[PDB]
């Protein structure tokens, strides 16, 4: 059973510096090399280097040459990501790799997204989002809810308290101003809306905010 | 183990300074097509200082 076993995702600012905990277990943690796999937030894996398990020697691909700090705990067979002067492509899910060595890396850590970005959090701004004439679809009448700015993620938007996932496609919250809209579509027949509420369920637990914001017709 | 590497003795550099040239001169070549010679050629008869 070994398993590669990481610090959580930690939200960051510029200029700080974050390490990135591996901690390796279910292998004699000396016999392997230990790596690291830079996965951007949207682009693919991008692998950071590794150190040596047994030495504690890092090595680092050119691009992550100098930035980084590959320092291990030999005992308790942790593995460290270490990103010193955090800048926003510091934002990024990062994997400890253990080493097959030239067959590759076997497995990985459960994945730490650090996220490097300046804003304080902030609660969404959440609209019940009412359709008009070229709104409805057939029985179905859509409805919406526009949460916006809030920073950080995420926000749980659920629908009457998530009785409503039906017609619901919650769309993936964006980044504006550093602060966050995601807009949720509920499909509510014409016959449920607004005869019955169909209401908008925004919880945001880092600004700790549960908006709910029912949609009712313009 | 004070700089940068856990082990001791030994090490790796490269070291890269962009080059650029501060001053830089030419030799050049004559053709001897290019080449002239100018000769002043001349005879005394009566003459003045001038």
Same mark, same amino acid.
């Given at each position: 059973?070994?398993?590669?076993?990481?610090?959580?995702?930690?939200?960051?600012?510029?200029?700080?510096?974050?390490?990135?905990?591996?901690?390796?277990?279910?292998?004699?943690?000396?016999?392997?090399?230990?790596?690291?796999?830079?996965?951007?937030?949207?682009?693919?894996?991008?692998?950071?280097?590794?150190?040596?398990?047994?030495?504690?020697?890092?090595?680092?691909?050119?691009?992550?040459?100098?930035?980084?700090?590959?320092?291990?705990?030999?005992?308790?067979?942790?593995?460290?990501?270490?990103?010193?002067?955090?800048?926003?492509?510091?934002?990024?899910?990062?994997?400890?790799?253990?080493?097959?060595?030239?067959?590759?890396?076997?497995?990985?850590?459960?994945?730490?997204?650090?996220?490097?970005?300046?804003?304080?959090?902030?609660?969404?701004?959440?609209?019940?989002?009412?359709?008009?004439?070229?709104?409805?679809?057939?029985?179905?009448?859509?409805?919406?809810?526009?949460?916006?700015?809030?920073?950080?993620?995420?926000?749980?938007?659920?629908?009457?308290?998530?009785?409503?996932?039906?017609?619901?496609?919650?769309?993936?919250?964006?980044?504006?101003?550093?602060?966050?809209?995601?807009?949720?579509?509920?499909?509510?027949?014409?016959?449920?809306?607004?005869?019955?509420?169909?209401?908008?369920?925004?919880?945001?637990?880092?600004?700790?905010?549960?908006?709910?914001?029912?949609?009712?017709?313009? | 183990?004070?700089?940068?590497?856990?082990?001791?003795?030994?090490?790796?550099?490269?070291?890269?300074? $962009?080059?650029?040239?501060?001053?830089?001169?030419? =030799?050049? +070549?004559?053709?001897?097509?290019?080449? $002239?010679?100018?000769?002043?050629?001349?005879?005394? =008869?009566? +003459?003045?200082?001038?």
């Amino acid at each position: 059973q070994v398993q590669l076993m990481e610090s959580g995702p930690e939200l960051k600012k510029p200029g700080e510096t974050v390490k990135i905990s591996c901690k390796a277990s279910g292998y004699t943690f000396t016999d392997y090399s230990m790596h690291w796999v830079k996965q951007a937030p949207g682009k693919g894996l991008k692998w950071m280097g590794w150190i040596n398990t047994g030495t504690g020697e890092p090595t680092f691909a050119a691009d992550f040459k100098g930035r980084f700090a590959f320092s291990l705990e030999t005992s308790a067979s942790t593995a460290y990501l270490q990103i010193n002067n955090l800048k926003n492509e510091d934002t990024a899910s990062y994997f400890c790799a253990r080493g097959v060595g030239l067959y590759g890396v076997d497995y990985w850590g459960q994945g730490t997204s650090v996220t490097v970005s300046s804003p304080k959090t902030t609660p969404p701004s959440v609209y019940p989002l009412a359709p008009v004439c070229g709104d409805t679809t057939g029985s179905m009448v859509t409805l919406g809810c526009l949460v916006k700015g809030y920073f950080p993620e995420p926000v749980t938007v659920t629908w009457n308290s998530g009785s409503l996932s039906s017609g619901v496609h919650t769309f993936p919250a964006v980044l504006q101003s550093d602060l966050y809209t995601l807009s949720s579509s509920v499909t509510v027949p014409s016959s449920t809306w607004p005869s019955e509420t169909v209401t908008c369920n925004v919880a945001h637990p880092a600004s700790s905010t549960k908006v709910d914001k029912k949609i009712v017709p313009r | 183990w004070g700089n940068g590497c856990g082990l001791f003795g030994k090490g790796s550099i490269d070291t890269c300074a $962009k080059f650029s040239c501060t001053s830089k001169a030419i =030799g050049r +070549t004559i053709q001897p097509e290019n080449i $002239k010679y100018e000769v002043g050629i001349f005879v005394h =008869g009566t +003459t003045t200082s001038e």
